[PDB]
Write a protein that binds this ligand. Structure first.
Ligand SMILES: C[C@H](Nc1nc(-c2c[nH]c3ncc(Cl)cc23)ncc1F)C(=O)NCC(F)(F)F
Length: 285
């Protein structure tokens, strides 16, 4: 089913990544329409449009409880709008920064298992998210989270287990595996490294002073700037410099983070095994 542009009523700006707006799709024009999230492009260049069309195809191909729902496209070709369900509790980063320790460990592990499940499903389609962070996870309700923003997602070539990015754009370097920093190589294993960073974000309750950029900048020295940050971060990770155990983090959860942060790509755990491990921890708790 088609969405007519004229019937998309702007309600509120949600955020910028392209931008996402909360809209009411109201073809009856009586304000009874469904509230949806709408992604559109700021700079709709031929390159960005081709890349956005790929994100649309990726999201449309995913049907999982822990993946944000594709609804449709509004064409009303060169100015596409991606229509998705609107998740009312916001990003997990915002949700956790607001409630903090009121979200207990059993609740954090329920979200962790769900993130692993959405990620494991994505891997079955040979998709590499490349931007797994709490800012890209949405909260549907207290019992369900979903992965969002497939804007950096790559499809693995037929004959390779990695995707090489030739000319990188803005990169979330503080969530990047060493091989992503050194060779711009992205794989299921590098999303697993990012997942360990997400686990760290959760157990630090999004405390700004404890954030992965704040901690890695302290380890490399706050005097490092621009490309020197990448140079020093690479040497730090090579020499086993890592984010600390968050205060009050259960030992078994910290063990998982450290295993995701293995310099050896092949030694990192799989998302299938991480969901099994997290569910066992939840069961024991
Ligand atoms: C740029 C957009 N930013 C934001 N979006 C929302 C949001 C709430 N509820 C939502 N429901 C469906 C969608 Cl698609 C977005 C939101 N809230 C705060 C934001 F800063 C974004 O896509 N962020 C990635 C992810 F969706 F994973 F959280």
């Amino acid at each position: 089913t088609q969405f007519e542009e004229r019937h998309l009523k702007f309600l509120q700006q949600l955020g910028k990544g392209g931008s996402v707006e909360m809209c009411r799709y109201d073809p009856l024009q009586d304000n009874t329409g469904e509230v949806v999230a709408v992604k559109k492009l700021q700079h709709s260049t031929e390159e960005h449009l081709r890349d956005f069309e790929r994100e649309i195809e990726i999201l449309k191909s995913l049907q999982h409880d822990n993946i944000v729902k594709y609804k449709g496209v509004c064409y009303s070709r060169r100015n596409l709008k991606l229509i998705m369900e609107y998740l009312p509790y916001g990003s997990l980063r915002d949700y956790l920064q607001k409630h903090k320790e009121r979200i207990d460990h059993i609740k954090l592990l329920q979200y962790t298992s769900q993130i692993c499940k959405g990620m494991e499903y994505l891997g079955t389609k040979r998709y590499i998210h490349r931007d797994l962070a709490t800012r890209n996870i949405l909260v549907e309700n207290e019992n369900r989270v979903k992965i969002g923003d497939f804007g950096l997602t790559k499809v693995l070539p037929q004959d390779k287990e990695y995707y090489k990015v030739k000319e990188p754009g803005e990169s979330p370097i503080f969530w990047y595996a060493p091989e992503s920093l050194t060779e711009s190589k992205f794989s299921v294993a590098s999303d697993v490294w990012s997942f360990g960073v997400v686990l760290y974000e959760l157990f630090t309750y999004i405390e700004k002073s404890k954030s992965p950029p704040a901690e890695f900048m302290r380890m490399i020295g706050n005097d490092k700037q621009g490309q020197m940050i990448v140079f020093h971060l690479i040497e730090l990770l090579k020499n086993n410099g890592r984010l600390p155990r968050p205060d009050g983090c259960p030992d078994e959860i910290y063990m998982i983070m450290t295993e995701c942060w293995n310099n050896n790509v092949n030694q990192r755990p799989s998302f299938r095994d991480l969901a099994l491990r997290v569910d066992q921890i939840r069961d024991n708790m």
